[PDB]
Design a binder for this molecule. Structure first.
Ligand SMILES: Nc1ncnc2c1ncn2[C@@H]1O[C@H](CSCC[C@H](N)C(=O)O)[C@@H](O)[C@H]1O
Ligand SMILES: Nc1ncnc2c1ncn2[C@@H]1O[C@H](CSCC[C@H](N)C(=O)O)[C@@H](O)[C@H]1O
Lengths: 216, 208
């Protein structure tokens, strides 16, 4: 199982893009968050409710822990709400606790990439917009939305062409319209008759893709 | 859906038990913040991982199976405390706010608006009358959850024990369980084991 990156535009895979991710640093440098920085966000005149980097953190853990990741058939990108685009190497160990995650994101946003000790390989890297320049050549692009017709993921995946990847844009936000990828996507689809958290929408999509692709 | 509790011995449901869960107050003890204290407490600092319990609870209670009313969660902490989770509790999304809620629960023994409730061990005295008990573990044969679930009788619940511990043998349920099963050829985090079970049961029970 070779490690997938944007250089490979052929291999059929699943891609998840965590869009409108709230990853923004402020010098106290910390990753702005609604719990710790209410006072600051308020005196900044920002919407207190929108600084939710915990959503991106939880989605990353969900996604990189999944069997489809371990089987080498997942890539994740992050598009932040400030327009930064980040390619996540499949093998990166995202810190399990929010505090260490926050430290890692500050370093990434400042330096533009993170490598390991011992290796030049970038495990996280800021790359140039737009995301469509990096995705596979044959890639169905979908936004997940409560407001769109509900699909069974297995069925949807089984309808892909044999050489066609699937890129899912998921809003990594507490609230907002699901229009964040309307210029890239082919279709919007819902996964449930209930509204879901971004992380659960991620897990549900991954599970369905695992099932359709016989990844256990 | 009417809210499932252990009082109802009959309704077919999925139950997940977060076993060996690290939930202890001093704040919630955790490896990131309390390394110095843990080593004065002669503890393996790497065991204090309430983040795992936090993540599993978000995964479980956010799942369509919960929203359809067909899920119950219990937590068995590493100090032997048993907690029944009310299906309608809103788990705080951030770890800092999660800690604040657990602290209250552990001290007062109950949270209400009973959203969270300390109950008497063992967990098997609370389970539905007809209930298969399974431990999820990388070390057992690998099932497709949908198929395994479809094999339950029409009146038979399933209770899944998931290790919410940092590492360790999956023997935390050995004297309680009917069977051990694997969910993957790859090692899984506890929260991923949970979603895999929830999602396979959603597919088996036509919950969308
Ligand atoms: N039932 C559903 N089906 C598919 N995706 C969903 C969903 N419910 C939520 N999502 C996805 O999960 C993300 C975060 S949910 C928060 C934003 C959402 N627009 C709202 O107002 O509630 C959404 O952006 C969307 O990408
Ligand atoms: N491949 C797999 N199949 C089924 N369950 C798994 C699994 N991998 C992990 N789990 C569940 O997730 C829990 C946490 S993973 C950490 C515990 C693991 N026994 C270890 O020492 O490495 C496990 O206790 C198990 O209940």
């Amino acid at each position: 199982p070779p490690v997938l990156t944007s250089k490979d535009k052929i291999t059929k895979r699943m891609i998840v893009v965590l869009a409108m991710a709230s990853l923004e640093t402020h010098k106290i440098y910390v990753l702005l968050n609604c719990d710790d920085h209410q006072g600051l966000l308020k005196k900044m005149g920002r919407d207190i409710s929108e600084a939710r980097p915990d959503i991106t953190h939880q989605c990353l853990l969900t996604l990189l822990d999944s069997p489809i990741n371990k089987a080498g058939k997942l890539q994740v990108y992050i598009q932040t709400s400030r327009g930064i685009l980040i390619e996540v190497n499949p093998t990166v160990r995202i810190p399990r606790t929010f505090k260490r995650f926050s430290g890692l994101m500050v370093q990434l946003l400042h330096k533009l990439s993170i490598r390991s000790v011992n290796s030049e390989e970038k495990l996280l890297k800021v790359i140039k917009n737009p995301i469509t320049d990096h995705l596979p050549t044959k890639c169905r692009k979908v936004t997940l939305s409560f407001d769109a017709p509900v699909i069974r993921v297995q069925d949807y995946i089984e309808k892909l062409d044999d050489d066609e990847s699937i890129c899912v844009f998921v809003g990594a936000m507490a609230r907002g319209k699901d229009n964040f990828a309307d210029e890239y996507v082919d279709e919007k689809v819902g996964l449930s008759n209930y509204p879901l958290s971004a992380s659960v929408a991620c897990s549900k999509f991954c599970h369905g893709a695992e099932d359709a692709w016989n990844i256990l």
